[PDB]
Amino acid sequence: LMIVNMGPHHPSMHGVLRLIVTLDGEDVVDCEPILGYLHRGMEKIAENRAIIQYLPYVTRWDYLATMFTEAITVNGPEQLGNIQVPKRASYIRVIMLELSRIASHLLWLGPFMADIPFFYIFREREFVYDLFEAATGMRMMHNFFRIGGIAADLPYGWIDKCLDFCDYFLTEVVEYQKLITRNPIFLERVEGVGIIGGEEAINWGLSGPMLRASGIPWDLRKIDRYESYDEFEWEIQWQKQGDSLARYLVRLSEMTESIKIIQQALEGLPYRFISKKPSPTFELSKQELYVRVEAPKGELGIFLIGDQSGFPWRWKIRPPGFINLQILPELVKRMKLADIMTILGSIDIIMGEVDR
Amino acid sequence: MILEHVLVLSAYLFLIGLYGLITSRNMVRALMCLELILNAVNMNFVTFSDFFDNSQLKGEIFCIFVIAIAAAEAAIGLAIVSSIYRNRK
Amino acid sequence: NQQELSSVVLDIGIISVWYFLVMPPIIMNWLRVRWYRRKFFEMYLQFMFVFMFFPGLLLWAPFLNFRKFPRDPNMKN
Amino acid sequence: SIKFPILDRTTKNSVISTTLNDLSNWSRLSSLWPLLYGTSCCFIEFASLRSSPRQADLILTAGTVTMKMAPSLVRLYEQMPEPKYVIAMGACTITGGMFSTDSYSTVRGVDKLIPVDVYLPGCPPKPEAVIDAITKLRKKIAREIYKDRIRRCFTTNHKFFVVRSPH
Amino acid sequence: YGLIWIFVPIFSLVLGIITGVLVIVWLEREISAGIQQPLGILQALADGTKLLFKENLRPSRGNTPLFSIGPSIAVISILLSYSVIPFSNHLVLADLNIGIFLWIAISSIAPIGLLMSGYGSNNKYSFLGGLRAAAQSISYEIPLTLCVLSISLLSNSLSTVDIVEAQSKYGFWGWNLWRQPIGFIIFLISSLAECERLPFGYQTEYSGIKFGLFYVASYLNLLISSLFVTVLYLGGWNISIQIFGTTIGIFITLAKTYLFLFVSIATRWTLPRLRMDQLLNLGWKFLLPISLGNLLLTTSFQLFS
Amino acid sequence: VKPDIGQWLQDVEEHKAIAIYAPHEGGYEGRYLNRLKMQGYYFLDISARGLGDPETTLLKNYPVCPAHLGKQPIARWYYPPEVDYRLAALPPSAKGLVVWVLEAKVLSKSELQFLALLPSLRPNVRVIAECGNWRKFVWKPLAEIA
Amino acid sequence: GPIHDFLLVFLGSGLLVGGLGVVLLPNPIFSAFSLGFVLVCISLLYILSNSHFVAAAQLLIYVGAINVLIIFAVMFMNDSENLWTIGNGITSLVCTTILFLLMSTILDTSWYGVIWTTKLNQILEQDLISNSQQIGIHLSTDFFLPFELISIILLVALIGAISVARQ
Amino acid sequence: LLYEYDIFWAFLLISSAIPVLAFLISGVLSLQFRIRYYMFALVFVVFDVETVFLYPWAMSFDVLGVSAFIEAFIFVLILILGLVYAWRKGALEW
Amino acid sequence: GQWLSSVTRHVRIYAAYIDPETCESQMDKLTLILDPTEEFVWDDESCNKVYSYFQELVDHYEGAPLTEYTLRLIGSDVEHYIRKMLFDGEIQYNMDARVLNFSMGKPRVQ
């Protein structure tokens, strides 16, 4: 039972974490995940900062998809103050949020395919960041979410590049879909892990790909009527093969479902930039409001107890992947050191929203 | 031509590996000493084939055979030592 | 006990200075002017050529003169 | 208020020795090869630009360093002790970054932890900023003539036992 | 005269393999600049001098002779077997009656250097890594020497210059690509897989000149495996379908080793790690029985010859 | 490359204000700084990419102004000068001069570069080692445009 | 010439001090690597003995196959314990007197005078000259019976090593 | 006779003196118990001796007819029967 | 794990078996490594004064459990003592390292 140190510079690059295991032989049997490495103290500083000052702070959580964090932390005060967002800016927010979900799943499967290369996905990623530069102007550090919608307007080149992104992107996606059917090393090196079912993934804490891996059509934005999700084409992954390749088909189907949503929303266009802007500064109320949104990892959440002041009295975040990190102590029991790379890939986690 | 000195080196190995085979704490040091003894006899056969028997390489053929049996002896002796290492706690 | 050649000088030294002087600037020039205009068959054979033709490039490695003018500019330094 | 150096002479004043020093310094300024050290928001520049933690002396700290990160970081600098230095490529390796006031478990720069040559603007710049940073560092090492191999150990210690109370 | 004419093929061969390992470094950099998108030629010598001019970095462990000679034996286990390559009909270093057999011995003394590296480092990381590297050098030796044996059985000779001549009788089809492509696949997977390249450290206390020794030892392992790809299957100097024959034959065999460098680095970048279980599943239950199988096939086939 | 001549040292001891026209092609710039350092001199660094009012920063004890993060006061203290404290940063007597290595030729203002070159003429031990807007070769043109 | 027999004496001194490193060192790991040095010198002696297939066979089989498993079992340290293993007065006595008999046997024997005799069976039959071919013709069909026997020996060695080493 | 490997001794001398000289010019100028891999090496050692036997036969098979063919055919039959034994038992198991 | 220290600039706890500069294994011998980066002058008599002051501070500040919080407190007020010693001119700077960042601010004309 030689204790692994599981150091800060991992052989893989998926964050800094601590997974000391007794490993009797090569079989890992007992996990003790030590965290606190990439920690900032978001809650106390968010109690010490306003919404327009913790609004630059929402970038250090799920920075592979930064639209979700600022999206839920601006959708908090919109439903809190009951201020209506017009349909145009809300649908463009839906388009860019699904594009960030696309970016999150491809930036998962990039380094996951690198561990188990970079320019096989970067040919797409250069045009993806060109879309981010034509949408807001930054690469992943955007500050463009207001109460009335997008802080700016879409330029006349970004809608043309958004029309071109579908037949720029879906063809290389379906050229990348056949690899797992062709290449048997993904049928023999990541096949098998992920043995949890649906009645158990509901039982512990799970959401996102680990909950849709068992063949459950789970969606917050389908159950909760949000952003007119029943107008668009939906196909939530009811893939019941359980394992890690079931999760890969889950993520391919989620990317293709977002492609279908954006492709139906290419020519929608139902309406200004910011509705209800009389003054630059405002405040918040005091309610008992827990707002959540469909994360790419499953139910990102914002807890809020107001102060009727410039600062929020309570600001607690429920990150999706940190609740999804609880299941590995149970998914460690009968695997190998060559398996834990596939495990910490298939969790689909970065340490930005973990410690926070 | 000092070339008969390699026989003296052979006898040096044949005495030192035998001394290490008598006084040995564990088993694997004595097994390595046994292998040095097989080396002493082995280089003796190679030297005698070099000196006398070069049409037939009978000493060198026996060198191949004695290094084969040295390999088999070392393999089974380490198998015994490893089975002891399994059977202790 | 053959000595089939019986040449004292200027047999392989001429070929050595030929291969070490005439070849490497034309080889490096073909590496420059065909950096993008290539099939992967052409990049394959150019990689095989630059692998075969390595140690002549030692006198041409630090020196670099006709390399950078993608305009019609003036030396305004 | 500073100290005084020795500054006697330059003993290696031949043409061959200064030629070898210039060539070894320019080749030392040519071969960066970082051990990457990402695992933060500055890891994103690695895909656009080893594993033995005693090998690559020319590492740049491209990560958000905290107080719990600090013992492993100074141990890793102990694993790169004599030859080369580090480059701060984050506002949090310089001033603590955006949390420079009120963060308890984040050090206000590694400028109180490790010798730093070059300070960056910080939050992920363009991928040619790291190229300009290693070019500057190459100009810095080109100024260095390997200090004419001039060496001093302090060795401050008490052999009196502390008033200990372990668990 | 009594030592100059003897020393200068050794000196020219050491300079040639230094240029070849420079080629392998910058050629993996060129394939990474093709798949990942002048001064760069001397950047590899800058890498060598960065790894050369450094600190000794010796910890407090008392294995200083083994700490010294660990990476040294790891270098010797490749460098001593460059006396083996018939680049043409001439300019081989020795006559070498046992041609490839000495290469199998010197490549088999490489796990001695791997275990000396695993003990020279006072770290459980490099201890486990030296165990793994020595075990995969052990494990991949048997189908390696099996396909070596099958090619030498086709030729009925062990000396490399004889088998290099022997491949040129039928012509272009007389090469061992069309005689043993199965054993060629065996030699491909044994060449790529043994050097910790096609699957995958253990240098966590070796630094300074010792890290450079492991560096040059790994890439010279790639060099000598590539040159045996040339002198076994592709041919030495024959393109059938004085002084100039040597100069064109060295170009032929360098084009062939550049071919295998491009194939090997491309196959490295398009295949991941075998995750250490399919590695041994290959080399013991699959690769060794099929190496014995085509050994039996070439044993049955040389009855009529 | 590597043209063996110390004519840049003759320029820095004759004119002491030369625009170092040299690319971003690695560290081919500090070798003459290393030859000035091996001559017994001491060389320190500056950059004009964020240096404003350069004569008011090299002398006249420009203010410290510590950046409080919304917690401390203004505390308008006077930091010591750049090159006056650098002349105060020569403890032995064998140091013949002080080299001011400047590595930003852009965002420099031609007038202020002439003001900084005149400030290199103010102290006799001051050497201006400014950049030269990144030419392809290594050119050491003097301060003629500034 | 003199380089040959001086290389012989150098190999002799290095091999005897490596063998005393096998016998009389506190570390069994140090003894095993001194064994590896000894067997490299043995292979060099067999190169000196004009038996080159023998040399590289002993280099292939006896550090590449033997000493790997030796150092495997040595780093996996197990346990400790009239010709018998009873020392400090017996093995020194019989070691010195058998050493004296062997020194008076080798040194006091005109070996080259015996090389002058039995010279007819080493006249090296002219139609072949190559060493490995001659090993193969004297090994495959001349000593066919032990060649067929070591197949059975190594078969039983593998089968017994499986049936013992697993348990 | 010191002609086949006469250049090889000098090759050994240069290659053996160069790492220690590199160490001099670099010094002047600046508890597991896993025995599965053990079991792999334990199968390896006897298969390696059998390859050593297979080496000079295939060197010298050309001068001999079908007799040496059936000699080493019985030999490799013993080899592959040991290999099938290694399959069917708990030998490799990885 | 095994490292139990609060190591900053000029203050390193390093409670290990370190008589000489060879690290090990870990014990109650707190080996105060000072100035790793060659930042100040650090004359030997002033180093002895600072080491004696740190010995008196760890003697009077113990009695509680010597866990990591006491290590943070003792390294922090040791750095305060070094700052107030260099501000009074007992510790000059170095100007022999490749940075010389003047980590405690430039001394004024006051």
Ligand code: SF4
């Ligand atoms: S300064 Fe900001 S972006 Fe840079 S490493 Fe620190 S937290 Fe990340």
